[PDB]
Design a protein around this nucleic acid. Sequence first.
RNA 1: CUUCUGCU
RNA 2: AGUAGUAACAAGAG
Lengths: 51, 736
Amino acid sequence: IKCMKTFFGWKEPNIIKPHEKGINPNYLLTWKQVLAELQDIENEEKIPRTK
Amino acid sequence: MDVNPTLLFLKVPVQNAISTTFPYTGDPPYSHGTGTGYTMDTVNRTHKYSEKGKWTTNTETGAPQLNPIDGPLPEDNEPSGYAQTDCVLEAMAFLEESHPGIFENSCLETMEIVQQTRVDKLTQGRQTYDWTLNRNQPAATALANTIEVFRSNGLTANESGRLIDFLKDVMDSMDKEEMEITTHGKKKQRLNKRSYLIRALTLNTMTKDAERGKLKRRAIATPGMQIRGFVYFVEALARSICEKLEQSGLPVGGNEKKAKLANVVRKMMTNSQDTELSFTITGDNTKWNENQNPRMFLAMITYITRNQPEWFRNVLSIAPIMFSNKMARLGKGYMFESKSMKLRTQVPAEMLANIDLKYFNKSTREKIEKIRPLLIDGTASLSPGMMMGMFNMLSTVLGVSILNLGQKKYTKTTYWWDGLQSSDDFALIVNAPNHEGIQAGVDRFYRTCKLVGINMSKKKSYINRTGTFEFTSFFYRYGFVANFSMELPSFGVSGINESADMSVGVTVIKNNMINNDLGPATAQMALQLFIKDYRYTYRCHRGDTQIQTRRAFELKKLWEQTRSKAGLLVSDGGPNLYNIRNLHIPEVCLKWELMDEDYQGRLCNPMNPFVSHKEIDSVNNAVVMPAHGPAKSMEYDAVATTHSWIPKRNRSILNTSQRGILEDEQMYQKCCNLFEKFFPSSSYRRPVGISSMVEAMVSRARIDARIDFESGRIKKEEFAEIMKICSTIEELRRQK
RNA sequence: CUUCUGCU
RNA sequence: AGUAGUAACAAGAG
């Protein structure tokens, strides 16, 4: 979380190279979900040892 | 500037840098799924390599058998199993002539072994096919189950405790018309004589997991309890013979093996004439097990046991006879899937004989079609060849006999040869006046091997000038080179227990420094890396560390309480005091002078519940499997400490039909552990006696009670209670 | 469903 | 999908 807070150049993610044999409207949502989870654990919560 | 480590060989000799060519720092290639495909392929290959033999049908098991002995001679370099009996007998006779009395003395010793060997010896080893359950079981469990089954069927001669009596019981069982077995609902099953025979000669098959240096996986086989009895005597005879053979490097091991090979090769190079050109051939033998026919071992056993008592010849020859009729169990089976319906399923190997061929792919379909004629009751007849043969020593003897045949007095020519042989690997030294002589000698040796069925693998063999070679992964370059990569897997946490790991780790570092050329700086760094791995694995970091782990609180409290931090064991967060100076000193003794008296007493408290002691054969001993070779027993120096606990046991059998077996095991332990309370030397030395345990324990209780009363260790009331209880126990046994 | 298991 | 590679996993038995 501290390392993530160090960078201030975050933009809106956008796919660039898609996995052929795979459903990609999933990797983008996964990254967005990870960011939201970090905000949820960073903004509040007890900062658990595992998330 | 493309870096290329292989270019390093342009300056450093390959052998001196051979460790670099070993990828043993990566995970070994495991085998996925069933071993049925590999077993069927092995059977098909074994029968194909002897396809020109005589086909017969057994009158007892009714399964087809192949006899390649005395078949046509090899008309091509293709691997051939058509061994010639006269050539094998001639090789054995020449071996006896070159070493007079070898067979007589070996038979005299082996005989005595036979007389003094007990049934318990079959408990050694692991993963034996328990014919009563059609599954692999620990040697002790399979032996006990077989003994219990025999007793229930009237075979009561094994009670003498001699292995020969158990073998006699096996023979009588073979003649039994019907056998009774128990299953668990504790049902009873009846086996006809034919079915018993098939399941008595059956060999279970699995895959050789974690094997290195090979791309394609292979299948290994485990025999049943009946075969193991005779196999032990045959191996004992072969070992006794091999101990007297200079070229046989199999019985010895470790530094003793390297010493023997270095001495033997040295002498061989020495006695060679100064005017004679010398060359060395290095290489394995292709399809060694698939071509070593059991009939040849029978012939060798009969020749070796000449003039010996008939009982000795029979007991020794029973093993090859059973192996010649052996049947290989196909295994777990196969797995099918439906993508459209999206569902999986497993077909047992017993169904392959009747299943349709449309479900298999082209390769498996061909393998099934080729094995279908030999498939009997879910097992394939495997008379030819020796699937994962336990006759490693016997095969080594045969190879040594072929090697010995290369003396100048047997070749009757200018060229001659000698060398070393262990199992399927060999290193041959050929001396001849000229290159033409060397070629003639190599051809003669190759042809003679083909004669006996042995066949050098031209694919993985090469010949160069004498002085450098490879034998069983030992690289000789004017002297054996200390390869260290082979011992890398032995480093790190062994995984025995919290205390045995430390002693084993330091012992491994010390042994590698002594044997495998581990430099002192490398030894130091290794020690550091091992302590770090040990701490990260057992969560025993230092008390003053801020690392967070579920075991950090207790360690932190212990560190704060102790006055002398240096005395704490590493397993208790203490600092590491090891170095090159004391790698041979157990950590308990190393820190004893610094340990706090309270902590010292708590850690070495003999009443602690964690410490448990099994038989002395399993005290301060561990089983370690190196990169190559079978498992080896490593002895480590460790003090009995609360850290010497035992890890949890697998409970997957707790939710299966065989869960009752585990329960039975518990009951047995509940009785054996009680006997230890009556006879303290039960673990140090094996107790003897024909009386029932209850009778021995009650008698001992009565004697001890009297002796304690007379000495005064117990009062009148306590003695009266003891006898009252003893009388009640006697009445309980009688009442039933 | 719940119970049981990660070598059996 | 993926691991992986001559056969598995992508939970299994109640």
